[PDB]
Design a protein around this ligand. Structure first.
Ligand code: MG
Ligand code: MG
Ligand code: MG
Ligand code: MG
Ligand code: MN
Ligand code: MN
Lengths: 762, 762
């Protein structure tokens, strides 16, 4: 007898539901929704109680944690699933894991966990394996089955982002390793407890494979608390309303979700084809990236083109033909994490007032060619900072959707896109309590947001992976890091220029304090801004590094000399560097590094990115430019060149607008634009000559060569666009950089007894 | 009710036995051995059946394996334990794990595995955790409890050396990582099966955390087979002879072992104090050691002094006060692996014809100060190539014991010591079967042995960790590595010079063939020979690297040009290098590297070390020098300078002795030695001046500074010996190299619910 209510096995149950979905186009073959249509009062009561239950689990259980990432920032999520692993309802927070935890349940279904090791009432499962769909090892899942009268009726999943998982690099978004081997403690749907009790062998092992043991332990108790709170609530709801009504809701709620997406697409968008692209930099050639494998030492660029099709029937399709290959770094991903993040974006714009569950995934088609960075075909890839690529590809999809909104008149919904979510301040060694430790600041939960068609973006406000941004309290971060704040400031000229300006980021200056045997490193975008502005707007600023060693600050503090405080207001004209005549200063574009020794009184700049702009900056309201200068959002010297606005300082020290001189400056910039530009055909003629001569850096050529091999339709498009002869070719081997993994790869499904679950066309 | 036969818990049972051992000086308080004394025929029958059973398990189960390390070389072991985790009998092979697997059982005892996760009939445990005593992660243990009528009566352990465990570096003895984080998949006494059946979550997880998956899987079936063969045999023996007799044997056999050691010490040795020391090099400053942490980039030297005391009552004591600190590399150890290796040495010299079990450990006292490399006090240390330090410290103990043998007249037992067991040929990528792979050659199972007081050492014959040496067949290694042999040759002038010559090593030249996306690296002693000669003999030769890239060998082979074959006969006067005019050749002292790209037709020299010599070379039989030159054991040019023997080539091409010219050369060398030497006081005066001026390299100064801090008795000895003033000091911080971990450390016993087992004074 199978364990699901009614007697099917888990696999029999899911296979029946997936076949009916495929045959009918409706989730589970549900052509009507009987509970919703015939018993609307009961449908709403179950919705209300269960949604309040999952929200309450997150709000309450987070008070268990010692880590501020969980306890203050709220980087956790609890989700309720039906027997087939499809989500019905969720808390807010890090909701990408609605998809990752469901995909882990489906892996158990498909690989016969029911027969061995068994799925029993009061069991506890733990999982973080990115090969079966997770974002990265630091997002740990606890999964508990739910039983009613001896049969399985659902599951509950809880996730927390933990500080570290014992990777080569000390942090969550770690560098140093270039493969799975060294990428952190990785757990594949392990049974870690039974009879509601954790096994001691699991406890002893797990706790010694991480740096931040005590923080790890309390994050685990946080996840188990919320899972058991939700299990208890489901048992009470079933006792009170009856299993038949709950059993109907558990599948109807998903189809209701799909219906909600379809309706919102037809109400808000326009049918058609939308084309867009994103990129980001991987500067691994630099000497301060000390990786232990020579085949990883090269500069590469991520490529993510998307063809987006909205159909007349309210279905839609996203095709990533042309994308670049996985690589020897920690930025690779998986079909589940990639597509779950697109679902997260949908929750922030298309479906925020519909059912928030897996229904909307069933209403979207995805094509991710096998072997690309978003659907890799090699079981050795590393994932610790998956986000570097993920957040840089998702931002372009906001631009496509915004063209539909703009065309139709829903200007309030337009958003030029998400910021790159970085820098991530990281490091390890001994802390102020004389214990082994690591740090990973979540200040980059609070980056700038994209401008709209109606108003400026928000500064220091959000991240694509959690719109409820929070930078945390300085006094709380000081309890969890051997560092002290010397500044926290809004980041001038970081927001993307436009008629409406993208949100600025912010910055903090840290001094090392009460640390021993300590190291730190940087992780974020450097040479490339991943976001683009929309309809005339510009990208946000890109990244850079500031650090200072052997500062002599102990003596400078004691003698009453000037000391660096605040932010690095104008990095082209800095004030701090001249105050530290004896220091070794690193001030450059190298926004990715591996761990380097730091001591007490050394300095580290944490810089959070801005978001992209909207519209021609020459149309910005002149008073808004003056307000931005007075408020620290824009440096005075760009008012003239970027916006054509002339400002002058009044008697009170405040800048005001010269309206006559501004009109003249803007008339003159219109003429300058015509004088400096050329017809696009003429510029194309010169660029085509460079392509024929192979005149670009190795990082540009490697990106095109790898993209061409994985995406023949893209190669054909490029050749046609640039009118290239068949005698021109770009083999990756002729560039002169290492190309390990370009031809030979071994997928996880090649190992014995492994059955992978397919979610996309590939 | 406790699970041990009679109703004691595991912990109650062991604690009672250890208290009686301490109170009486006899294992388990056994003042007489009733079964042995009153029923000698039955005692011998149990011995015979059970020893044959464990020998048969090793011989038979190894035929399961795909890895030649297990199947041909026999790098596996099976051991039978009593309920308290003390060994009764063992197969031969890698018998250091008699101690490591017993210490893992004792960890389970001491940490209440009985209450959670429980210890049940037909359970399967797996373990490799070096923090609780194991050599390194590549030695995997399977441990099965043995029950009789529902109560526990013993355990069986089986170990195999596996090819890799998914460390940063591709190999068993890996470099690249500098901490536990990246040192390989580490398993802490995990329950991996029940009802004789392995759990699917364990199978899926374990198999994706290693490169050599198929080899891993068959090594696991090998261990479970032998464990279950032995469990069945114990059940049959108990059924036939009765539980009462078996229960007596299970403790008497251990005390019989202790009695055997005591008697052998009093029959073979001399009471007194013996003083000796060993060293080895860690050249991590070199650019070809690409580690990901800057605090690890420095040159250091391992220091292992030993004060050995043999008492009038036949007890003995080994004290390692003065030893150097753990470091940021893969060469650290643990009190269990260090002391178990001394027990292995004992089995090869003192007790080979006594009971081979834990009894001899109870008859030996060890002192390893906490924080030294052999008893570290930090839970972050790495262990993948523990042996580098271990084999370099154990060799000196042969010299001490040999002075007792020599003095008493047991010249047949003298041995100048064990070779350094290296090089380890390692690497990874795609193999000839187009799968992900790693290699780790066990050619260094067959190194030279130390000379005796009666005869030469054996060439290419053994290792300290397994005296049954085997180099493997070339045709078998070619099935498991994408490499082909171009040479296999005895290594001339590697054996340590003496009246009796130490065994030579051997060498093999490899060409890369049918590999893709391939890397390789070197691991062994370079600047320092760890072994010393005895009573006038010399150390074996030290290590070096030869590798060649971009060789052009495809064209050289095809054109009929000379190609490198055989061994690198005289590395001072090489022949291969001139044959490869277009190659990039690396020929130097850097015997430790991290992974480097290699391609088909590139070359790698695998060089196995020799063993130390005995006596003044001027007393060697002249014909034996001529035989050595003719046989390829010694290069011609050293006959005159080292041995004072004059040889000449006859008409037949063979070297022969000039007996008259040899007598004259030896008389003249005696005079040369007197003329070139100085009185030891005079030499001491000049060396003391250098010490006072701090004139030595950073690696020498760091070794003394670290040793002084951990060993105040050693600092006092050094100051007294060299008559140094109190104004002279050597703080580690003044050297100018990184010193992370010199003051701050956190032991595994500081984590919650961890109870460590103590085996030594510290
Ligand atoms: Mg492939
Ligand atoms: Mg498969
Ligand atoms: Mg003289
Ligand atoms: Mg403790
Ligand atoms: Mn996370
Ligand atoms: Mn081993």
């Amino acid at each position: 007898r199978g364990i699901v209510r009614g007697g099917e096995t888990l696999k029999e149950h899911r296979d029946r539901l997936m076949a009916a979905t495929k045959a009918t186009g409706r989730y589970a073959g549900l052509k009507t929704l009987e509970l919703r249509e015939r018993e609307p009062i009961l449908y709403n009561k179950l919705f209300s109680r269960l949604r309040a239950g999952v929200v309450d689990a997150r709000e309450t259980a987070k008070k268990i944690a010692a880590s501020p990432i969980v306890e203050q920032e709220g980087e956790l999520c609890f989700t309720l699933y039906n027997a087939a692993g499809d989500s019905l309802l969720t808390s807010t927070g890090i909701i990408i894991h609605v998809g990752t935890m469901g995909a882990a349940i489906k892996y158990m279904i498909e690989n016969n966990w029911e027969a061995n090791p068994g799925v029993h009432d009061k069991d506890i499962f733990c999982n973080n394996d990115s090969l079966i769909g997770n974002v990265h090892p630091c997002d740990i899942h606890t999964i508990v089955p739910i039983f009613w009268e001896g049969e399985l009726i659902g599951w509950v999943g809880g996730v927390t982002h933990v500080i570290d998982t014992g990777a080569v690099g000390p942090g969550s978004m770690a560098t140093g390793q270039v493969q799975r081997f060294g990428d952190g403690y990785s757990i594949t749907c392990r049974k870690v407890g039974a009879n509601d009790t954790l096994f001691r062998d699991w406890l002893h092992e797990s706790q010694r494979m991480v740096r931040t043991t005590r923080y790890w332990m309390l994050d685990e108790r946080t996840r188990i608390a919320g899972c058991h709170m939700i299990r208890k609530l489901v048992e009470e709801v079933v006792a009170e309303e009856g299993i038949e009504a709950y059993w109907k809701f558990a599948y109807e709620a998903v189809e209701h979700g799909r219906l909600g997406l379809q309706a919102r697409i037809k109400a808000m968008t326009i049918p058609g084809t939308y084309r867009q692209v994103g990129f980001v930099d991987v500067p691994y050639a630099h000497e301060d990236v000390r990786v232990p494998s020579d085949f990883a030492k090269l500069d590469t660029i991520m490529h993510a083109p998307c063809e987006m099709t909205i159909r007349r029937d309210g279905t839609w399709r996203l095709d990533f033909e042309g994308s670049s290959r996985w690589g020897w770094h920690t930025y690779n991903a998986h079909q589940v994490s990639f597509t779950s993040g697109i679902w997260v974006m949908m929750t922030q714009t298309l479906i925020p007032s519909e059912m928030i569950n897996d229904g909307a995934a069933y209403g979207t088609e995805f094509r991710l060619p096998k072997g690309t960075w978003m659907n890799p075909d090699d079981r050795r890839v590393a994932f610790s900072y998956s986000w570097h690529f993920l957040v840089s590809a998702w931002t372009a999809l906001w631009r496509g959707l915004s063209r539909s909104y703009f065309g139709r008149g829903y200007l309030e919904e337009v958003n030029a896109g998400n910021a790159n979510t970085s820098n991530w301040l990281q490091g390890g060694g001994f802390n102020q309590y004389d214990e082994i430790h690591a740090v990973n600041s979540f200040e980059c939960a609070a980056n700038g947001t994209g401008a709209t068609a109606v108003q400026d973006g928000l500064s220091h406000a959000a991240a694509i992976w959690n719109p409820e941004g929070d930078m945390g309290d300085m006094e709380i971060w000081e309890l969890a890091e051997p560092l002290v704040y010397l500044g926290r400031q809004i980041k001038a000229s970081s927001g993307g220029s436009g008629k409406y300006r993208g949100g600025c980021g912010f910055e903090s200056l840290r001094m090392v304090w009460n640390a021993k045997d300590w190291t730190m490193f940087f992780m974020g975008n450097g040479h490339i801004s991943s976001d683009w502005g929309l309809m005339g707007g510009y990208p946000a600023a890109s990244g850079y590094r500031f650090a200072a060693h052997k500062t002599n600050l102990k003596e400078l503090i004691a003698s009453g000399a000037e000391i660096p405080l605040g932010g690095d207001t104008d990095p082209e004209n800095p004030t701090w560097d001249a105050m530290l005549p004896d220091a070794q200063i690193k001030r450059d574009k190298q926004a990715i590094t591996t761990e380097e020794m730091f001591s007490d009184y050394d300095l580290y700049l944490n810089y959070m990115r801005g978001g992209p702009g909207f519209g021609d900056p020459l149309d910005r309201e002149p008073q808004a430019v003056a307000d931005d200068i007075n408020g620290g959002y824009v440096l005075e010297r760009f008012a003239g060149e970027v916006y054509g606005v002339v400002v002058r300082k009044g008697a009170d020290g405040q800048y005001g607008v010269d309206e006559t001189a501004t009109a003249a400056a803007r008339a003159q910039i219109r003429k300058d634009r015509l004088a400096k530009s050329v017809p696009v055909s003429e510029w194309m003629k010169g660029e085509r000559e460079k392509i024929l001569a192979k005149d670009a850096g190795t990082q540009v050529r490697q990106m095109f060569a790898a993209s061409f091999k994985l995406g023949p339709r893209f190669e054909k498009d490029f050749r046609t666009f640039w009118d290239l002869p068949d005698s021109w070719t770009l083999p990756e081997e002729e560039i002169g950089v290492p190309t390990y993994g370009s031809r030979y790869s071994m997928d996880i499904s090649e190992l014995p007894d492994v059955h992978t679950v397919q979610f996309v066309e590939e």
